[PDB]
Amino acid sequence: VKELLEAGVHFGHERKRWNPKFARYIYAERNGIHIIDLQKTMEELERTFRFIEDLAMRGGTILFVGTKKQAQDIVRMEAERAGMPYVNQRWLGGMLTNFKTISQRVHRLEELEALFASPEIEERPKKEQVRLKHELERLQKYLSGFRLLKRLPDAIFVVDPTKEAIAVREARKLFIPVIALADTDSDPDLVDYIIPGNDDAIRSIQLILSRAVDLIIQARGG
Protein backbone atom coordinates (compact mmCIF):
# COMPACT_ATOMS: atom_id res chain seq x y z
CA VAL A 1 0.00 0.00 0.00
CA LYS A 2 0.79 3.70 -0.39
CA GLU A 3 -0.41 6.82 1.35
CA LEU A 4 -2.08 9.98 0.19
CA LEU A 5 -0.70 13.43 0.65
CA GLU A 6 -2.00 13.28 4.18
CA ALA A 7 -0.48 16.59 5.27
CA GLY A 8 -3.04 17.60 7.84
CA VAL A 9 -1.16 15.48 10.35
CA HIS A 10 2.67 15.37 9.88
CA PHE A 11 4.58 18.42 9.06
CA GLY A 12 6.90 18.82 11.93
CA HIS A 13 6.84 18.50 15.69
CA GLU A 14 9.71 19.80 17.78
CA ARG A 15 10.77 23.31 18.70
CA LYS A 16 14.47 24.30 18.48
CA ARG A 17 16.00 21.24 20.27
CA TRP A 18 16.80 19.62 16.93
CA ASN A 19 19.88 17.76 15.77
CA PRO A 20 21.85 19.53 13.03
CA LYS A 21 22.11 16.24 11.14
CA PHE A 22 18.37 16.26 10.60
CA ALA A 23 18.53 19.38 8.43
CA ARG A 24 18.18 17.24 5.31
CA TYR A 25 14.62 16.54 6.35
CA ILE A 26 13.33 19.98 7.17
CA TYR A 27 11.28 22.42 5.09
CA ALA A 28 11.55 25.59 7.18
CA GLU A 29 10.78 27.22 10.53
CA ARG A 30 7.31 28.55 11.30
CA ASN A 31 6.34 30.11 14.60
CA GLY A 32 9.59 28.73 16.03
CA ILE A 33 8.93 25.10 15.01
CA HIS A 34 10.70 22.94 12.42
CA ILE A 35 8.60 21.63 9.58
CA ILE A 36 9.50 18.36 7.94
CA ASP A 37 9.51 18.37 4.13
CA LEU A 38 6.82 15.77 3.31
CA GLN A 39 7.67 15.53 -0.37
CA LYS A 40 10.72 13.91 1.16
CA THR A 41 8.91 11.70 3.68
CA MET A 42 7.24 10.19 0.66
CA GLU A 43 10.66 9.39 -0.77
CA GLU A 44 11.55 7.63 2.50
CA LEU A 45 8.28 5.79 3.02
CA GLU A 46 8.50 4.38 -0.50
CA ARG A 47 11.69 2.66 0.63
CA THR A 48 10.98 1.75 4.19
CA PHE A 49 7.76 0.13 3.17
CA ARG A 50 9.64 -1.72 0.52
CA PHE A 51 11.89 -3.20 3.23
CA ILE A 52 8.94 -4.37 5.23
CA GLU A 53 7.24 -6.12 2.32
CA ASP A 54 10.59 -7.80 1.71
CA LEU A 55 10.76 -8.87 5.32
CA ALA A 56 7.15 -9.81 5.68
CA MET A 57 6.73 -12.07 2.70
CA ARG A 58 10.14 -13.49 3.49
CA GLY A 59 8.38 -14.44 6.73
CA GLY A 60 10.38 -12.29 9.12
CA THR A 61 9.90 -10.90 12.60
CA ILE A 62 9.70 -7.21 13.57
CA LEU A 63 9.87 -6.15 17.15
CA PHE A 64 7.74 -3.11 17.78
CA VAL A 65 9.19 -0.78 20.33
CA GLY A 66 7.83 2.47 21.70
CA THR A 67 8.08 3.39 25.39
CA LYS A 68 6.59 6.84 24.83
CA LYS A 69 3.53 7.63 26.90
CA GLN A 70 1.53 8.58 23.81
CA ALA A 71 2.41 5.51 21.70
CA GLN A 72 1.78 3.12 24.62
CA ASP A 73 -1.82 2.26 23.69
CA ILE A 74 -0.86 2.10 20.00
CA VAL A 75 2.17 -0.11 20.03
CA ARG A 76 0.18 -2.78 21.89
CA MET A 77 -2.51 -2.67 19.21
CA GLU A 78 -0.48 -2.82 16.03
CA ALA A 79 1.95 -5.60 16.96
CA GLU A 80 -0.89 -7.78 18.10
CA ARG A 81 -2.09 -7.49 14.56
CA ALA A 82 0.70 -9.14 12.71
CA GLY A 83 1.95 -11.77 15.06
CA MET A 84 4.57 -9.27 15.89
CA PRO A 85 6.33 -8.97 19.30
CA TYR A 86 6.43 -5.56 20.95
CA VAL A 87 7.81 -3.60 23.83
CA ASN A 88 5.10 -1.60 25.55
CA GLN A 89 5.61 -0.82 29.27
CA ARG A 90 9.40 -0.37 29.61
CA TRP A 91 12.42 -1.44 27.55
CA LEU A 92 14.76 -3.77 29.48
CA GLY A 93 18.41 -3.06 28.92
CA GLY A 94 19.68 -6.06 26.98
CA MET A 95 16.50 -7.52 25.67
CA LEU A 96 18.70 -8.09 22.68
CA THR A 97 22.29 -8.08 23.77
CA ASN A 98 21.58 -10.11 26.86
CA PHE A 99 18.63 -11.98 25.30
CA LYS A 100 19.54 -15.45 26.50
CA THR A 101 19.55 -14.04 30.08
CA ILE A 102 16.19 -12.44 29.63
CA SER A 103 14.54 -15.16 27.67
CA GLN A 104 15.08 -16.87 31.03
CA ARG A 105 12.64 -14.41 32.56
CA VAL A 106 10.22 -15.56 29.88
CA HIS A 107 10.36 -19.13 31.08
CA ARG A 108 9.61 -17.86 34.59
CA LEU A 109 6.30 -16.63 33.26
CA GLU A 110 5.75 -19.91 31.49
CA GLU A 111 6.30 -21.78 34.73
CA LEU A 112 4.12 -19.59 36.83
CA GLU A 113 1.20 -19.54 34.40
CA ALA A 114 1.27 -23.31 35.01
CA LEU A 115 1.04 -23.22 38.79
CA PHE A 116 -1.99 -20.95 38.74
CA ALA A 117 -4.10 -23.48 36.92
CA SER A 118 -2.84 -26.66 38.58
CA PRO A 119 -3.95 -28.00 41.99
CA GLU A 120 -0.84 -26.70 43.75
CA ILE A 121 -2.29 -23.25 44.32
CA GLU A 122 -3.92 -22.64 47.72
CA GLU A 123 -2.25 -25.88 48.74
CA ARG A 124 1.04 -24.71 50.20
CA PRO A 125 2.00 -21.55 52.18
CA LYS A 126 0.05 -18.43 51.34
CA LYS A 127 2.96 -16.10 51.99
CA GLU A 128 4.59 -17.53 48.86
CA GLN A 129 1.24 -17.34 47.08
CA VAL A 130 1.19 -13.56 47.29
CA ARG A 131 4.93 -13.65 46.58
CA LEU A 132 4.28 -15.62 43.43
CA LYS A 133 1.10 -13.81 42.45
CA HIS A 134 3.10 -10.59 42.29
CA GLU A 135 5.75 -12.06 40.03
CA LEU A 136 3.27 -12.82 37.25
CA GLU A 137 1.80 -9.43 37.83
CA ARG A 138 5.07 -7.81 36.90
CA LEU A 139 5.82 -10.21 34.07
CA GLN A 140 2.42 -9.72 32.54
CA LYS A 141 3.64 -6.14 32.09
CA TYR A 142 7.10 -6.01 30.69
CA LEU A 143 7.13 -9.33 28.91
CA SER A 144 3.55 -9.10 27.59
CA GLY A 145 4.86 -8.84 24.04
CA PHE A 146 8.42 -9.94 24.24
CA ARG A 147 7.10 -13.44 24.84
CA LEU A 148 6.61 -13.91 21.13
CA LEU A 149 10.41 -13.80 20.64
CA LYS A 150 11.62 -17.35 19.99
CA ARG A 151 14.98 -15.89 18.80
CA LEU A 152 16.29 -12.32 18.17
CA PRO A 153 14.14 -10.36 15.64
CA ASP A 154 15.09 -9.57 12.02
CA ALA A 155 14.31 -5.84 12.45
CA ILE A 156 13.13 -3.36 14.97
CA PHE A 157 10.39 -0.86 14.56
CA VAL A 158 11.11 1.88 16.98
CA VAL A 159 9.05 4.98 17.49
CA ASP A 160 10.98 7.68 19.36
CA PRO A 161 14.54 6.78 18.28
CA THR A 162 16.20 9.25 20.56
CA LYS A 163 14.25 7.97 23.58
CA GLU A 164 14.92 4.38 22.64
CA ALA A 165 18.54 4.96 21.66
CA ILE A 166 19.22 2.13 24.12
CA ALA A 167 17.23 -0.32 22.08
CA VAL A 168 18.75 1.20 18.96
CA ARG A 169 22.24 0.95 20.47
CA GLU A 170 21.79 -2.74 21.10
CA ALA A 171 20.30 -3.55 17.77
CA ARG A 172 22.87 -1.48 15.99
CA LYS A 173 25.53 -3.68 17.66
CA LEU A 174 23.83 -6.94 16.76
CA PHE A 175 23.42 -5.89 13.15
CA ILE A 176 19.61 -6.05 13.29
CA PRO A 177 17.98 -3.55 10.92
CA VAL A 178 16.46 -0.41 12.42
CA ILE A 179 13.16 1.15 11.39
CA ALA A 180 11.97 4.19 13.20
CA LEU A 181 9.37 6.92 12.95
CA ALA A 182 11.81 9.78 13.36
CA ASP A 183 11.94 13.54 13.34
CA THR A 184 13.60 16.80 14.32
CA ASP A 185 15.32 15.52 17.45
CA SER A 186 16.75 12.21 16.14
CA ASP A 187 20.14 11.19 14.73
CA PRO A 188 19.00 9.90 11.28
CA ASP A 189 22.58 8.89 10.73
CA LEU A 190 21.80 5.76 12.74
CA VAL A 191 18.46 4.60 11.55
CA ASP A 192 18.55 2.03 8.74
CA TYR A 193 15.08 2.98 7.50
CA ILE A 194 13.78 6.39 8.56
CA ILE A 195 10.23 7.72 8.46
CA PRO A 196 10.55 11.46 9.14
CA GLY A 197 7.53 12.64 11.05
CA ASN A 198 5.67 14.16 14.00
CA ASP A 199 5.16 11.69 16.76
CA ASP A 200 3.91 12.96 20.14
CA ALA A 201 0.62 13.09 18.19
CA ILE A 202 -1.50 9.99 18.47
CA ARG A 203 -2.80 10.90 15.04
CA SER A 204 0.78 10.47 13.71
CA ILE A 205 1.94 7.36 15.47
CA GLN A 206 -1.38 5.75 14.65
CA LEU A 207 -1.14 6.42 10.97
CA ILE A 208 2.47 5.53 10.57
CA LEU A 209 1.96 2.17 12.25
CA SER A 210 -1.38 1.15 10.76
CA ARG A 211 -0.30 1.71 7.17
CA ALA A 212 2.82 -0.34 8.01
CA VAL A 213 0.92 -3.25 9.43
CA ASP A 214 -1.59 -3.26 6.65
CA LEU A 215 1.50 -3.55 4.49
CA ILE A 216 2.66 -6.44 6.74
CA ILE A 217 -0.53 -8.39 6.39
CA GLN A 218 -1.25 -7.83 2.69
CA ALA A 219 2.32 -9.09 2.25
CA ARG A 220 1.64 -12.49 3.73
CA GLY A 221 -1.73 -12.64 1.92
CA GLY A 222 -4.49 -12.25 4.50
Place this chain on the structure above:
RNA sequence: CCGUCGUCAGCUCGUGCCGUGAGGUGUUGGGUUAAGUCCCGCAACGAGCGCAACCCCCGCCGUUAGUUGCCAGCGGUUCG
Protein backbone atom coordinates in the same frame (compact mmCIF):
# COMPACT_ATOMS: atom_id res chain seq x y z
C1' C B 1 35.13 -24.78 68.97
C1' C B 2 34.15 -19.93 70.88
C1' G B 3 34.35 -14.29 71.76
C1' U B 4 33.72 -9.94 68.72
C1' C B 5 31.88 -5.83 65.07
C1' G B 6 26.85 -7.87 64.93
C1' U B 7 20.67 -10.21 64.60
C1' C B 8 24.04 -5.04 62.23
C1' A B 9 22.07 -5.37 56.71
C1' G B 10 25.09 -6.00 54.61
C1' C B 11 28.67 -9.20 51.37
C1' U B 12 28.91 -10.77 46.39
C1' C B 13 28.33 -13.47 41.50
C1' G B 14 26.79 -14.66 36.03
C1' U B 15 25.64 -12.65 31.85
C1' G B 16 24.71 -7.53 29.48
C1' C B 17 26.46 -2.49 29.31
C1' C B 18 30.33 1.72 30.78
C1' G B 19 35.72 2.67 31.03
C1' U B 20 42.67 2.27 27.75
C1' G B 21 42.53 0.48 32.96
C1' A B 22 42.24 -0.04 38.36
C1' G B 23 37.19 -0.43 38.51
C1' G B 24 31.57 0.85 37.66
C1' U B 25 26.72 -0.63 36.90
C1' G B 26 23.23 -4.17 39.38
C1' U B 27 23.33 -3.09 45.51
C1' U B 28 21.82 3.07 43.18
C1' G B 29 18.29 7.43 43.50
C1' G B 30 12.76 8.93 45.18
C1' G B 31 9.06 6.29 48.65
C1' U B 32 8.62 2.37 52.38
C1' U B 33 10.37 -1.49 56.12
C1' A B 34 12.20 -4.03 61.92
C1' A B 35 15.51 -5.42 57.29
C1' G B 36 19.59 -5.08 50.27
C1' U B 37 11.51 -5.46 53.49
C1' C B 38 8.79 -4.17 49.71
C1' C B 39 7.01 -0.02 45.67
C1' C B 40 8.52 3.55 41.65
C1' G B 41 12.06 4.58 38.84
C1' C B 42 17.11 3.24 36.00
C1' A B 43 21.55 -0.36 31.39
C1' A B 44 20.37 -3.77 33.33
C1' C B 45 18.17 -9.05 34.19
C1' G B 46 18.83 -12.49 37.38
C1' A B 47 21.20 -15.52 41.08
C1' G B 48 24.18 -16.88 45.96
C1' C B 49 25.44 -16.09 51.15
C1' G B 50 22.26 -12.84 54.78
C1' C B 51 16.46 -10.80 55.99
C1' A B 52 12.10 -13.29 56.14
C1' A B 53 10.01 -17.97 56.01
C1' C B 54 9.97 -23.78 57.48
C1' C B 55 11.13 -25.51 63.69
C1' C B 56 10.15 -25.03 69.57
C1' C B 57 7.58 -22.36 73.88
C1' C B 58 3.26 -18.73 75.16
C1' G B 59 -2.07 -16.78 74.22
C1' C B 60 -7.98 -18.66 71.48
C1' C B 61 -10.32 -22.78 69.64
C1' G B 62 -11.13 -28.28 67.26
C1' U B 63 -10.30 -33.80 66.93
C1' U B 64 -8.21 -38.09 69.19
C1' A B 65 -7.07 -39.79 74.45
C1' G B 66 -9.29 -40.55 79.96
C1' U B 67 -6.61 -43.69 87.21
C1' U B 68 -5.25 -35.57 86.82
C1' G B 69 -9.82 -33.51 86.90
C1' C B 70 -15.79 -32.81 89.29
C1' C B 71 -22.28 -33.32 93.46
C1' A B 72 -20.06 -30.18 86.68
C1' G B 73 -25.54 -34.46 87.61
C1' C B 74 -27.26 -38.68 90.87
C1' G B 75 -26.39 -42.53 95.51
C1' G B 76 -23.34 -43.30 100.49
C1' U B 77 -19.08 -40.54 104.22
C1' U B 78 -14.61 -41.77 109.11
C1' C B 79 -18.14 -35.15 104.74
C1' G B 80 -10.69 -36.21 102.82
